[PDB]
């Protein structure tokens with residue numbers, strides 16, 4: 001299995017992502033996305049380009065990426081701080097079941113996986129997420145994929161932020 | 163016919179359903195009290211599915227930094243906030259809300275330290291064109307400590323391809 | 329004519345200010361000092377620095393700034409809520425004439441005027457006041473200078489406060 | 491001893507009050523007057539009734555009452571925001587001694603005390619002030635009279651305002 005050959009399921013409607021908010025990243029590749037909460041945002045009313053925004057929140061720090069649909073079931077991201085672009089895909093999505101939401105998404109460096117994010121709001125109980133991670137961590141560079149929530153900062157009264 | 167004179171006497175409109183706020187996402191703060199909230203984008207978040215207390219969350223986003231406060235409804239049309247980093251509480255109210263009109267959304271909210279105003283946030287997604295917002299800001303300025311309320315969106319940092327984040 | 333080149337008359341002795349109390353601001357730059365009564369206060373008996381205090385009173389709101397003499401006929405202000413300093417000067421003073429008191433004072437942001445206050449206790453009849461306002465209105469930012477006493481709140485039996 | 495029988499010393503000339511400015515309230519009855527600085531103002535030049543004004547300043551909030559002399563060594567107050575009147579008296583005054591100023595004033599609800607204000611600019615060292623407070627605390631409702639200056643807000647570089 002190589003990164004270019006991973007499943008590319010259709011990007012669900014944006015409202016399906018918003019109704020999942022907030023999510024946590026159970027498995028990620030790089031350290032950057034440990035202990036992280038995901039919130040999706042609709043394009044602003046006056047947005048010229050109507051891009052959505054993904055928020056990756058880690059304590060008092062935040063990474064932001066606008067995204068739009070692209071070819072081959074892709075999401076095309078723009079880093080709001082750097083203007084760097086990336087092409088992402090969904091390995092699967094399972095949003096808004098009666099047991100909540102999960103998905104796994106990725107971006108490729110050719111055959112190797114550059115970044116991986118599996119999010120949920122059900123504490124990792126979706127059987128699809130288990131299968132998906134097992135598959136992804138056998139692609140080249142997928143050895144780096146790890147459980148992301150092990151030893152996270154203590155909270156001060158909020159459930160999904162710290 | 164006279165404007166309220168102290169913070170404790172400001173108007174307290176019913177808190178709209180959360181959905182009305184989420185559908186306004188994202189907003190910008192046009193007027194704030196402390197300069198912590200200059201150049202800031204607001205995003206509202208529903209309670210997590212597994213949340214024990216069903217608190218919503220307000221995100222105050224300024225570049226690569228974020229301030230987070232959980233909130234729930236309280237009596238007298240209050241929102242009770244819990245700072246997620248410190249655990250400090252505050253009782254907030256809405257001076258007015260005007261969400262999802264044909265010209266977009268605006269509101270102004272505040273929290274008092276007795277008769278003074280401790281914090282003030284006026285948000286919108288229509289570049290400050292709601293006439294309610296103009297008159298609300300004038301009123302709030304006149305209460306004790308309200309002279310610090312200022313326009314919050316001058317000279318904000320340049321963007322790298324996103325409209326509402328930087 | 330720019331703000332840095334406006335006149336700087338000697339700050340009168342504090343007693344002359346206190347004898348003028350209370351004043352109203354007839355012309356100001358920002359909206360903050362609309363419908364406002366000025367009262368000057370001597371340093372507290374126990375004050376270590378012996379700063380005087382200017383009180384700006386608008387209904388139930390009070391803004392307070394300690395001040396002392398500085399170089400070049402300046403008054404150095406300390407906002408009592410924030411510890412922020414500002415350097416002020418008098419364009420002119422005309423205190424305790426047989427027709428009462430007036431003055432115009434200002435603070436600069438380099439060449440533009442950041443704030444302007446013209447006070448009196450004679451309903452704006454001092455001819456010096458008219459000429460000072462006409463000059464200040466011509467400095468950069470001075471177009472915002474405006475008459476400050478239109479449509480002020482109704483009173484409940486006191487003359488200078490509401 | 492009831493409120494109606496408390497001493498009524500002559501109201502000193504206004505200039506004595508102004509020379510005492512600013513004062514702090516060390517003892518009060520209602521907690522409105524905690525952490526409060528008092529400033530006296532002469533009548534506005536143009537005022538038709540020539541009423542003086544008492545300012546009660548607590549941080550950024552100000553209460554204002556015009557006042558004139560009435561019979562039996564009374565001062566008749568007019569709340570500038572609500573138009574409400576009240577007859578006040580001085581239990582004693584001791585202004586502008588070589589150890590500074592102190593006074594205690596009150597207003598009655600028949601035989602009970604409705605409000606009490608003991609002011610000074612010397613941190614409570616006037617022996618008259620101790621005796622006066624003792625006496626007032628024993629009239630009906632005087633049990634509410636408390637020390638007004640515990641745990642007041644921290645300052646930002648001004649001595650008498652915050």
Ligand SMILES: [Cl-]
Nearest residue numbers: 054105106117
């Ligand atoms: Cl993702």
Ligand SMILES: [Cl-]
Nearest residue numbers: 220271272283
């Ligand atoms: Cl808010």
Ligand SMILES: [Cl-]
Nearest residue numbers: 382433434445
């Ligand atoms: Cl001034």
Ligand SMILES: [Cl-]
Nearest residue numbers: 544595596607
């Ligand atoms: Cl008094």
